[PDB]
Structure 1
Amino acid sequence: SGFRKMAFPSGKVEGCMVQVTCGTTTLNGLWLDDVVYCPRHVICTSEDMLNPNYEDLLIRKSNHNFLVQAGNVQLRVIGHSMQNCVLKLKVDTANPKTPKYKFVRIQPGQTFSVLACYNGSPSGVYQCAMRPNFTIKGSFLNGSSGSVGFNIDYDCVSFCYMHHMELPTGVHAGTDLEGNFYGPFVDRQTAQAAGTDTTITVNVLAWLYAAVINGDRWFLNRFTTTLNDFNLVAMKYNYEPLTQDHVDILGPLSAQTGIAVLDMCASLKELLQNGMNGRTILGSALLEDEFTPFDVVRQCSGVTFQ
């Protein structure tokens, strides 16, 4: 019993982390097969970040300007190329610990584990989510660019995020493993600011189903509602729309607990209109939205990754 914010096992990702040094800038790299991936702003300084011309700055750089360290071992860069906002550094040796992996671009509301790294050495792992405004509420200090976010999909490591920048409000922005920034952010030190962040509705409902599995039933009511009636109320509380596909994804948790998805929406509407009244749900005094439906099934069923 019990319910906790839980990250994925980081073992297969630790064996892929690498240090990449360029001139006077140092960050982290992802070593998969014979290719190292890292943010492209490693070739620039703090002065260049105000408006960097990445094309002309990479023309000046050569293969010997890229120092890649795999722990206490130096790697030999034999090729380099830029794809959007990341660099692909071809090395002469394949990582022996290379796991079965994919590159995926996640939708807003999806959760993942972040292996925060510094100088190519992992120091921590935590579970966060891609916010609706395409930011993440991570924990990163200076020098953590190149850290990766990932899911474990059955037998495969699903890389979905690489950390790049910190925004003025304290949140973070980054790219997928193809160099494309999530949202309208760029790798330039400017005045870009995140929009208003909303609550991931389908995750709150999955979290409420987790509370029912673990014994909490005080928020259930004898009310009921439709999708439009619920969406119109949650809209004024900055909640994301609940699609008909989201109702289908919550199907398994609705059938296991015997509570209709629309009945659970009626419960959430009361909590939005009346609050928690100082009460707690699964050890939290507010509504948690960083648990996807499958995240609930993994913890409650003890899903293991071999």
Structure 2
Amino acid sequence: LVKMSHPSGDVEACMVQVTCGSMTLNGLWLDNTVWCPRHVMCPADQLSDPNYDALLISMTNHSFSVQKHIGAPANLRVVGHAMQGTLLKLTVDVANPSTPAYTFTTVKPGAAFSVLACYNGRPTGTFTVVMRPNYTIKGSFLCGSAGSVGYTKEGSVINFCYMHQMELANGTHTGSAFDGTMYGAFMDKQVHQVQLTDKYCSVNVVAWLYAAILNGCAWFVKPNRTSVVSFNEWALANQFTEFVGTQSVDMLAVKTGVAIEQLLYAIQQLYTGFQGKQILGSTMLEDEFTPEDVNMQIM
């Protein structure tokens, strides 16, 4: 059970550097469009209250410089600009010759995706995250990583689901979907904002306990059961998400012979403390492995 990411080559070929005035960050070049956070337009003196409608008017095509450093370089010419929620949509006069087949879909809490971290348009690392129940993610993002993208891949099709926007007050990160909406509705300004409480992703904890059983670690399995409806009542009071079963979870239950409701009961007990014991090299519950992850990696 390792933290697995998709191979990043397809997305690396799309990363560019976008500069506007004194701001520089990353953009995603797909066909004739370069996507980037709209806060590239924010002046250094208006961090706390930018008017993005106003800033958009004051811009022309010549206000944005776009450079591709990786691979086959350029030196793109911006020939149009528009704003879409919290994103800039720049039109450039060359279609990216390495554009993958792609879609734009918003991810839901508990779902995993790969992130390609970039600085000044250069990819530097990749890792996998889950969208937290409070619509934040915990990866490794340093200064200038804005515009780094998160994505999944199915067959030949990349689903772009995240473009990094900002660090929040609790050391945590959020970003936009490519429809322009910010995950969790955070504002792209220097302003005090509160994030809701995080929660354990119940269905991923279930998947992880199934991975433990599959690896011969089942000391926590009892005959006792908690129904889904009763677990979901308990979860509201203990910062767990609502458990929603899936065909992926059912495959693990069939394979191990341990019912979902046995693991729901185990979670309730393990939340109280592991006593002196370990599960898959961990002394706490793990909720960043999805049922699909466990099925892929162990079956």
TM-score by length of 1: 0.93
Please report how far the alpha carbon of residue 185 of structure 1 lies from its aligned counterpart in structure 2 after TM superposition: 0.7
Deviations 1:99-144 (CA, angstroms, capped at 9, x unpaired) = 1111000111111111110000000011111111111112111111
* Counterpart-to-counterpart distance in 2, 1:83 and 1:229: 42
Q: Aligned AA for 2:185?
A: P
Residue 304 of structure 1: aligned partner: none
Residue 34 of structure 2: aligned partner: 36
Spell out the pairing of 1:101-116 with structure 2 (5 A cutoff).
Answer: 101-116=102-117
- Size of the aligned set, in residue pairs, is 296
Q: Aligned AA for 2:40?
A: V
Residue 251 of structure 1: aligned partner: 250
Residue 221 of structure 1: aligned partner: 222
Maintained 8 Å contact 2:248/2:295: no
Deviations 1:57-107 (CA, angstroms, capped at 9, x unpaired) = 111111111100011421111111111110111111111211111100011
* Counterpart-to-counterpart distance in 2, 1:104 and 1:232: 30
Spell out the pairing of 1:160-199 with structure 2 (5 A cutoff).
Answer: 160-199=161-200
Is 1:23 matched up with 2:21?
yes
Maintained 8 Å contact 1:234/1:272: no
List alignment gaps of at least 5 residues for structure 2: none
Residue 50 of structure 1: aligned partner: 48
* Counterpart-to-counterpart distance in 1, 2:266 and 2:2: 22
* Counterpart-to-counterpart distance in 1, 2:210 and 2:242: 18
Spell out the pairing of 1:141-290 with structure 2 (5 A cutoff).
Answer: 141-243=142-244, 246=245, 248-273=247-272, 275-290=273-288
Deviations 1:279-300 (CA, angstroms, capped at 9, x unpaired) = 2222222111011111212222
Residue 121 of structure 2: aligned partner: 120
Q: Aligned AA for 2:28?
A: L
Aligned-residue identity in percent: 50
* Counterpart-to-counterpart distance in 1, 2:276 and 2:44: 47
Please report how far the alpha carbon of residue 235 of structure 1 lies from its aligned counterpart in structure 2 after TM superposition: 3.4
Q: Aligned AA for 1:261?
A: I
Residue 2 of structure 2: aligned partner: 4
Please report how far the alpha carbon of residue 278 of structure 1 lies from its aligned counterpart in structure 2 after TM superposition: 3.1
List alignment gaps of at least 5 residues for structure 1: 302-306
Deviations 1:8-31 (CA, angstroms, capped at 9, x unpaired) = 111111111110011110000001
Q: Aligned AA for 1:271?
A: L
Please report how far the alpha carbon of residue 159 of structure 1 lies from its aligned counterpart in structure 2 after TM superposition: 0.7
Maintained 8 Å contact 1:199/1:289: yes
* Counterpart-to-counterpart distance in 2, 1:250 and 1:121: 38
Residue 64 of structure 1: aligned partner: 62
TM-score by length of 2: 0.95
